[PDB]
Motif scaffolding. Structure first.
Motif, PDB file in Angstrom:
ATOM      1  N   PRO A  73      18.715  82.742  45.458  1.00  0.00           N
ATOM      2  CA  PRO A  73      19.866  82.814  44.536  1.00  0.00           C
ATOM      3  C   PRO A  73      19.318  83.247  43.175  1.00  0.00           C
ATOM      4  CG  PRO A  73      20.031  80.848  45.893  1.00  0.00           C
ATOM      5  CD  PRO A  73      18.621  81.408  46.091  1.00  0.00           C
ATOM      6  N   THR A  74      19.888  84.292  42.604  1.00  0.00           N
ATOM      7  CA  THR A  74      19.408  84.798  41.326  1.00  0.00           C
ATOM      8  C   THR A  74      19.272  83.731  40.245  1.00  0.00           C
ATOM      9  OG1 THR A  74      20.375  86.902  41.905  1.00  0.00           O
ATOM     10  CG2 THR A  74      19.719  86.592  39.617  1.00  0.00           C
ATOM     11  N   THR A  75      20.154  82.734  40.258  1.00  0.00           N
ATOM     12  CA  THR A  75      20.091  81.668  39.271  1.00  0.00           C
ATOM     13  C   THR A  75      18.815  80.843  39.390  1.00  0.00           C
ATOM     14  OG1 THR A  75      21.303  80.070  40.670  1.00  0.00           O
ATOM     15  CG2 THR A  75      22.597  81.442  39.201  1.00  0.00           C
ATOM     16  N   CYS A  76      18.128  80.939  40.530  1.00  0.00           N
ATOM     17  CA  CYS A  76      16.890  80.166  40.740  1.00  0.00           C
ATOM     18  C   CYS A  76      15.670  81.062  40.974  1.00  0.00           C
ATOM     19  CB  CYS A  76      17.044  79.239  41.952  1.00  0.00           C
ATOM     20  SG  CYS A  76      18.560  78.228  41.978  1.00  0.00           S
ATOM     21  N   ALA A  77      15.872  82.369  40.910  1.00  0.00           N
ATOM     22  CA  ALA A  77      14.785  83.305  41.166  1.00  0.00           C
ATOM     23  C   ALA A  77      13.609  83.262  40.185  1.00  0.00           C
ATOM     24  CB  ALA A  77      15.357  84.742  41.283  1.00  0.00           C
ATOM     25  N   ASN A  78      13.615  82.327  39.242  1.00  0.00           N
ATOM     26  CA  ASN A  78      12.503  82.232  38.302  1.00  0.00           C
ATOM     27  C   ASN A  78      11.388  81.333  38.891  1.00  0.00           C
ATOM     28  OD1 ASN A  78      13.248  79.253  36.977  1.00  0.00           O
ATOM     29  ND2 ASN A  78      14.981  80.450  37.804  1.00  0.00           N
ATOM     30  N   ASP A  79      11.649  80.723  40.039  1.00  0.00           N
ATOM     31  CA  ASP A  79      10.643  79.871  40.669  1.00  0.00           C
ATOM     32  C   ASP A  79      10.770  79.991  42.183  1.00  0.00           C
ATOM     33  OD1 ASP A  79       8.824  77.954  41.406  1.00  0.00           O
ATOM     34  OD2 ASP A  79      10.200  76.285  41.003  1.00  0.00           O
ATOM     35  N   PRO A  80      10.529  81.194  42.717  1.00  0.00           N
ATOM     36  CA  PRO A  80      10.631  81.393  44.163  1.00  0.00           C
ATOM     37  C   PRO A  80       9.682  80.485  44.957  1.00  0.00           C
ATOM     38  CG  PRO A  80      10.496  83.504  42.965  1.00  0.00           C
ATOM     39  CD  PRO A  80      10.019  82.406  42.041  1.00  0.00           C
ATOM     40  N   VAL A  81       8.494  80.193  44.427  1.00  0.00           N
ATOM     41  CA  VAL A  81       7.582  79.329  45.183  1.00  0.00           C
ATOM     42  C   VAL A  81       8.202  77.949  45.319  1.00  0.00           C
ATOM     43  CG1 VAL A  81       5.315  78.196  45.312  1.00  0.00           C
ATOM     44  CG2 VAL A  81       5.489  80.570  44.416  1.00  0.00           C
ATOM     45  N   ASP A 104      24.353  87.917  44.931  1.00  0.00           N
ATOM     46  CA  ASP A 104      23.973  86.742  44.150  1.00  0.00           C
ATOM     47  C   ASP A 104      22.513  86.353  44.393  1.00  0.00           C
ATOM     48  OD1 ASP A 104      26.725  86.398  43.215  1.00  0.00           O
ATOM     49  OD2 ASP A 104      27.176  85.412  45.159  1.00  0.00           O
ATOM     50  N   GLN A 105      21.734  87.256  44.996  1.00  0.00           N
ATOM     51  CA  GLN A 105      20.327  86.971  45.333  1.00  0.00           C
ATOM     52  C   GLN A 105      19.285  88.052  45.031  1.00  0.00           C
ATOM     53  OE1 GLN A 105      21.170  86.764  49.540  1.00  0.00           O
ATOM     54  NE2 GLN A 105      21.271  84.516  49.481  1.00  0.00           N
ATOM     55  N   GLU A 106      18.023  87.658  45.127  1.00  0.00           N
ATOM     56  CA  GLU A 106      16.886  88.560  44.969  1.00  0.00           C
ATOM     57  C   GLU A 106      16.129  88.414  46.292  1.00  0.00           C
ATOM     58  OE1 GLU A 106      16.811  90.533  42.913  1.00  0.00           O
ATOM     59  OE2 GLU A 106      17.918  89.614  41.218  1.00  0.00           O
ATOM     60  N   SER A 107      15.494  89.500  46.734  1.00  0.00           N
ATOM     61  CA  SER A 107      14.686  89.494  47.941  1.00  0.00           C
ATOM     62  C   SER A 107      13.236  89.561  47.489  1.00  0.00           C
ATOM     63  CB  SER A 107      14.985  90.715  48.807  1.00  0.00           C
ATOM     64  OG  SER A 107      16.114  90.459  49.617  1.00  0.00           O
ATOM     65  N   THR A 143      23.698  94.514  49.562  1.00  0.00           N
ATOM     66  CA  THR A 143      24.829  94.450  50.491  1.00  0.00           C
ATOM     67  C   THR A 143      24.392  93.908  51.856  1.00  0.00           C
ATOM     68  OG1 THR A 143      24.524  96.591  51.562  1.00  0.00           O
ATOM     69  CG2 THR A 143      25.671  96.578  49.424  1.00  0.00           C
ATOM     70  N   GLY A 144      23.477  92.939  51.845  1.00  0.00           N
ATOM     71  CA  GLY A 144      22.977  92.371  53.082  1.00  0.00           C
ATOM     72  C   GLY A 144      23.625  91.055  53.454  1.00  0.00           C
ATOM     73  N   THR A 145      23.255  90.541  54.623  1.00  0.00           N
ATOM     74  CA  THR A 145      23.813  89.288  55.118  1.00  0.00           C
ATOM     75  C   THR A 145      23.637  88.102  54.177  1.00  0.00           C
ATOM     76  OG1 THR A 145      21.804  88.492  56.158  1.00  0.00           O
ATOM     77  CG2 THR A 145      23.147  90.089  57.381  1.00  0.00           C
ATOM     78  N   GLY A 146      22.673  88.175  53.261  1.00  0.00           N
ATOM     79  CA  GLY A 146      22.456  87.035  52.386  1.00  0.00           C
ATOM     80  C   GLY A 146      21.758  85.866  53.082  1.00  0.00           C
ATOM     81  N   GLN A 147      21.296  86.050  54.315  1.00  0.00           N
ATOM     82  CA  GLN A 147      20.575  84.975  55.004  1.00  0.00           C
ATOM     83  C   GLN A 147      19.252  84.697  54.280  1.00  0.00           C
ATOM     84  OE1 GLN A 147      22.325  84.232  59.328  1.00  0.00           O
ATOM     85  NE2 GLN A 147      20.190  84.896  59.203  1.00  0.00           N
ATOM     86  N   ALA A 148      18.785  83.447  54.332  1.00  0.00           N
ATOM     87  CA  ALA A 148      17.587  83.011  53.603  1.00  0.00           C
ATOM     88  C   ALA A 148      16.239  83.637  53.934  1.00  0.00           C
ATOM     89  CB  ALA A 148      17.463  81.497  53.707  1.00  0.00           C
ATOM     90  N   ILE A 149      15.913  83.743  55.217  1.00  0.00           N
ATOM     91  CA  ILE A 149      14.628  84.292  55.622  1.00  0.00           C
ATOM     92  C   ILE A 149      14.900  85.333  56.690  1.00  0.00           C
ATOM     93  CG2 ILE A 149      12.418  83.634  56.711  1.00  0.00           C
ATOM     94  CD1 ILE A 149      12.658  80.974  55.208  1.00  0.00           C
TER      95      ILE A 149
END
Ligand code: ZN
Ligand code: ZN
Ligand code: ZN
Ligand code: ZN
Ligand code: ZN
Ligand code: ZN
Ligand code: ZN
Ligand code: ZN
Ligand code: ZN
Ligand code: ZN
Ligand code: ZN
Ligand code: ZN
Ligand code: ZN
Ligand code: ZN
Ligand code: ZN
Ligand code: ZN
Ligand code: ZN
Ligand code: ZN
Ligand code: ZN
Ligand code: ZN
Ligand code: ZN
Ligand code: ZN
Ligand code: ZN
Ligand code: ZN
Lengths: 118, 118, 118, 118, 118, 117, 118, 118, 118, 119, 118, 118
Positions: free
Chosen positions: F88-96, F55-58, F40-46
């Motif tokens: 974005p969870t849809t891309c969380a398989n390659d965070p690097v 819709d995201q992973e931290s 339930t956060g702002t969803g900001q990138a960094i």
């Protein structure tokens, strides 16, 4: 030789665990640690400011026995071996790097727990 | 012992000159430099990253052989010997500290001028 | 007397061993350690951020009881005493410098092994 | 909030004792320490280079559990938690800050004394 | 291939020797050194602050030619190449990394010994 | 696995391009990025604390940084170390690779193409 | 005066060459280099830790004679003149700054090639 | 002699008071401070960026006159003398080290209180 | 109480003026400064490297009485109190933190202006 | 030296960049001696890169040689974003690499110069 | 009022968010940021090396306007405002600390998005 | 103009003397010092942590007024003006750079000697 194992450990998120798992896989221990030509009449304590091997040990240059120093990466201790001398039981001197990682120095007597302590 | 000599040079305006005169008055050379156990099949070069003693040399820990590191004072050159190994012609191995002060490393061969070079 | 003893230890390859040999030869312990004027109703732990002497101890400023700080040389431990206060049993307070070199702080209760611990 | 207690300890001459006295008075533990999602339980060690939480532990970001880091003041120990992960027994995971101040990591096994050790 | 070779030398106890042994085993020279597009009207001196290539030399970015910079490890010399330009005889420009490790700059004329000096 | 790929990029003259070509050649993304347990956060990138929205992973910042993971200097110092990155969870398989490939919107602080505007 | 010459060189992409070209064009040498009293017939070596002027030289303050220190810009060499004393033949002392840029210290005897060496 | 006195002061808890006491015991001042050669008299200010001795003073290199730099120990004041020049009244120039310790620079005119000031 | 006052001053744009206003409004002086147990045969100077309290002064640990060190913020002087001892007239020793902000050390005799000086 | 006068002028100005701009505005000769790279010219074309990335419409230069602050030996106001990297400059503006980088912007999205390669 | 609000944000895990929430609850903006007296012939860009306020802005000293500098805590971004000048639209000059947290500088024109940009 | 004076002083062996002679020969004072917008009801002290001009002074950003900071060279004094505010009597505010070089702050009252003091 060493480059292969060191490269493997250097980039692992946990270098020490990677070396451990590597060895448990039958991997060859890191070699090329440097040994001191000493008296072997020392205190026998584990990590000292001058070579202190007794008759049951070898004295190695600390940094040459440090996994992080050898992998050129940051330390997680900076380094308590660099610039010092590490006394390792002769029966374990085939793996100086792995020995300090696997063992503990007694806070009271200064000797390796299980190899000199008490 | 070493403390008297080291103390005398450490506070002199020119420590290397003070050690030289001390030896000239017949003072005993500084001892307790750390000698490495090696195979004596090295390049024979003077100051190297690993022990490189050849047949006619002894390899020592560099900081052990540095007048400035032994005196705990600032360097004149940081330090070119610390963390490295110094190969000393065996017949001059009674005074490793004094040897490096008196001799020159050949810019080409990397060996001591007058000792193993060209 | 302090400068003579400190000079001898500062230039030894093993300063702690030099002070220990020196005391065993009957040398007088290093003085001028600075004492704290405190309550003497403190935790009694060995090395603290504010004075903590209990009724059977004296509190001293750390750096003044550290052989390496007193000798102005690098530390083999950076320094666990500088900026802190060291509590020393009153019957041993005549040699605060040697006391902390010879004794061990219990990693559990924070008191000196053999003098307060458990 | 956390600012009231953190501010109170930050300026105390002994921040750890202030937090202790604060809790002893019934104060609420400092919150907002960050938690790591460890999915394949780890070694259970107290302080590690990557999350290592057991089935019965929670993993927190080292700096978030450090009173000194949370108060933005110099440490007394750099900091041994920052950049690392601290595993706290689930039953005490409501006060990660106070937990590391009250407990001891075993030098032999690396687990908390009284919680995991032996 | 560059990363394979750099990784091999980076973790070797003597990186310069490791690279030498690899080239002697027929290994291909490290590539991707950076070249300057200049008018080759330079002094022709070895290591300079601005590109100084004469007609029979190529000017390279110093760091790109340094084995230690390319390997991202500490230097044993710090780096006398980083930030400067290295002039390499055209007939040896296929191996800029190994060239500086094998040759000597004349202290007198500043040109490479054996290539330009005197 | 990770060691092989990280070694490859660590010594390349352009680490980011090396990881790009590795992925393009079908290589497996670097794993072992540290995932945060959050709400339930702002969803900001960094961010300075975990801020994933639904819709995201931290992830712990440095864990997802190619340069930190390779232990080499940065070209950016590091804008991830010590912070948290929302992916974005849809891309969380390659965070690097994700942060290397995407841009944070200077205005709203969210990923260009994933949350921004 | 010295400021005009110094500013010209400070911003050149190659300061040494700029000073050299300025001198070739008839320019006046940089002045205001500091000199110190030599308290014995010195060794006559070029760069030393204390004044070492022979009866044919004069001892100048190193930084005073350094084009880079005088121009307040980072060095190329860090600085091998700063903090030391530079010996210049008396009849060449009208241009200490240029003298050291123009000449070479013999790595063997430590005297200027051409003015003292061998 | 210089080493003897500096060694005594270096390890005293108060180096300046030890020097004062040594002199009061009839000890000889520290020698070998480095004197500057001036072609013209200067402003006569006590501590300057270039030599400034007037007709009643001699200029000395600052570090050579600093008890702490000479004893190679941490400063108390970093160092306000190092890298500058100290003008000492000629009648007191037999002890430049002790002079700056015993005297005060006038904050208004910049000369020594009691010699030159007002 | 101390945390509340220090908190208030630490975030003010002018910390010393904040403490000053707090005292003028009748606030209680900051406490918990550390006191030295000494002979009281000292020089009586204001700020010294070892305790120097005379019969009518108390010697306190420097950082303990520094407002900036207590507030953990940068100094606007580095800090002239830290690592040293501050002598405070007995009759003003109830407010050591405020005392040093309100008073001036005589550049000449080293004592506090209006208390001991001349 | 060729650039010493203009560099000295900017180095001590309160705003070095504005001083160079005014200088150019008054007909001053752009700073020279920037170092050019010999590269593929089939690169990504991005503005500031870790290795030469010029495309056929650019020239790659060594960063520091193109930095007014590095050339003036003064502290930076941006350490430095050019030092140790390479700058790709439109061939038609390659006569003033020091000024081109002060006057233009790198697209945070595509990494190319706004107005010269971006979108 | 400043110390209370700065105190609350300094110890919060997210200082900028604590300030935002404090303002949203009706909190009074931080005061005492310093303004520059200029002619207002400036470019109007947001963050500059010299005051650049145009007719519709105030120029503030950057550190006075920085939440982290005012809170004396480490920065998240080192600090891009310190040592510089921040131009703030006059209509928002009542909350310069909050302004820069809430707004964005246009990378293209260098002015604040929504206040000057385009 | 400003660049002309600053370049001349920057490379002089004594910058403050150079600016002093330049003024003495009719030189125009350095301009572009930054003036603070303030109430002019401050303490009137010379160098403060916040703008403190009274009705007879102007307040200036410190670095803007410091010859060393304006010349981009190392200081002799890091810097006492940088980060602070300098109060200059309005009658002398046409040359803030020279005013601080020529005047003295009273160590007791903190105001300029001759302009505010006693
Ligand atoms: Zn190590
Ligand atoms: Zn034991
Ligand atoms: Zn050394
Ligand atoms: Zn040779
Ligand atoms: Zn110590
Ligand atoms: Zn115990
Ligand atoms: Zn911490
Ligand atoms: Zn255990
Ligand atoms: Zn290199
Ligand atoms: Zn030659
Ligand atoms: Zn990173
Ligand atoms: Zn957006
Ligand atoms: Zn120099
Ligand atoms: Zn010679
Ligand atoms: Zn000194
Ligand atoms: Zn006076
Ligand atoms: Zn302080
Ligand atoms: Zn007085
Ligand atoms: Zn730059
Ligand atoms: Zn674009
Ligand atoms: Zn800031
Ligand atoms: Zn815009
Ligand atoms: Zn300044
Ligand atoms: Zn006054």
């Amino acid at each position: 030789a060493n480059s292969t194992v060191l490269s493997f450990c250097a980039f692992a998120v946990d270098p020490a665990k990677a070396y451990k798992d590597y060895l448990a896989s039958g991997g060859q221990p890191i070699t090329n640690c440097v040994k001191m030509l000493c008296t072997h009449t020392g205190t026998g304590q584990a990590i000292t400011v001058t070579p202190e091997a007794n008759m049951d040990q070898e004295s190695f240059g600390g940094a040459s026995c440090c996994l992080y120093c050898r992998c050129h990466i940051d330390h997680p201790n900076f380094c308590d071996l660099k610039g010092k001398y590490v006394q390792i039981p002769t029966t374990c001197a085939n793996d100086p790097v792995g020995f300090t990682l696997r063992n503990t120095v007694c806070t009271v007597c200064g000797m390796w727990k299980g190899y000199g302590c008490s």
